[PDB]
């Protein structure tokens, strides 16, 4: 029962929305329309995470709209948000299945734990959480 062995972890896989904290507080603060907020907590969207050595891909799926972003780890690359805001940043791995990135005042800390994703964002005095699980 349960057999695995590897040095690093595989980001490659698809994950569905499970749970969330400070979603409305964060979304109202970044200035999202209340339609995208009511559908965003009511409907469970889908996520995908893809790793290609130094390259990295991420698919966001919020009910029907799909956003695809690409970046290269340790190199300056431009990332699109849910509203279409394109912002230059770099993403670093801490060697522990966890990617960290910062734009201005929004502190992203991603974490992968096998079949579970844990995403923790912090914009100023607001602290948004997202949890997803493998499909
Ligand atoms: C159901 C759905 C629609 S799925 C969904 C939606 C949004 C997120 C973002 C959260 N985020 C924080 C950081 C937010 C900025 C991020 C930059 C690159 C990709 C776009 C946004 C993030 O993914 N960080 C890193 C990023 C690329 C490298 C590894 C992960 C994640 C899943 C929902 O959650 O509503």
Experiment type: NMR
Query: Whole-angstrom Cα distance, residue 86 to residue 98?
Result: 23
Q: Which of 13, 45, 46, 60 to mutate to test the pocket of ligand 1 (most atoms within 8 A of CB)?
A: 60
Query: 29 C-alpha to center of ligand 1: Å?
Result: 17
Task: Tell me which DSSP letter residue 15 carries.
Answer: E
- According to the CATH classification, is domain 1-135 in 3.40.640.10? no
Place of tokens 């965003």: 40
- CA atoms of 16 and 111, how far apart (whole Å): 15
How far is residue 41's CA from residue 20's CA, in Å, rounded to a whole number? 8
DSSP characters over 57-103: EEEEEETTEEEEEEEETTS-EEEE-TT--EEEE-EEE-SSS-EEEES
Choose one of 74, 119, 121, 122 to mutate for the ligand 1 pocket test, by most ligand atoms within 8 angstroms of C-beta: 119
Atom of ligand 1 nearest to the CA of 121: 12
Q: How many helices (H) and strands (E) does the chain have?
A: 2, 11
Residues touching ligand 1 (Cβ under 6 Å) are 17, 40, 45-47, 56, 58, 60-62, 69, 79, 81, 91, 99, 108, 110, 119, 121, 130
């Amino acid at each position: 029962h349960h057999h695995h062995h590897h040095v690093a972890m595989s980001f490659s896989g698809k994950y569905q929305l499970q749970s969330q904290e400070n979603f409305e507080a964060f979304m109202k603060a970044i200035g999202l329309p209340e339609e995208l907020i009511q559908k965003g907590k009511d409907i469970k969207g889908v996520s995908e995470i893809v790793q290609n050595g130094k390259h990295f891909k991420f698919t966001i799926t919020a009910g029907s709209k799909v956003i695809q972003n690409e970046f290269t780890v340790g190199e300056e690359c431009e990332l699109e948000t849910m509203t279409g805001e394109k912002v230059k940043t770099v993403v670093q791995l801490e060697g522990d299945n966890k990617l960290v990135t910062t734009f201005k005042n929004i502190k992203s800390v991603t974490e992968l734990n096998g079949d579970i994703i844990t995403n923790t964002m912090t914009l100023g005095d607001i602290v948004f959480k997202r949890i997803s699980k493998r499909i």
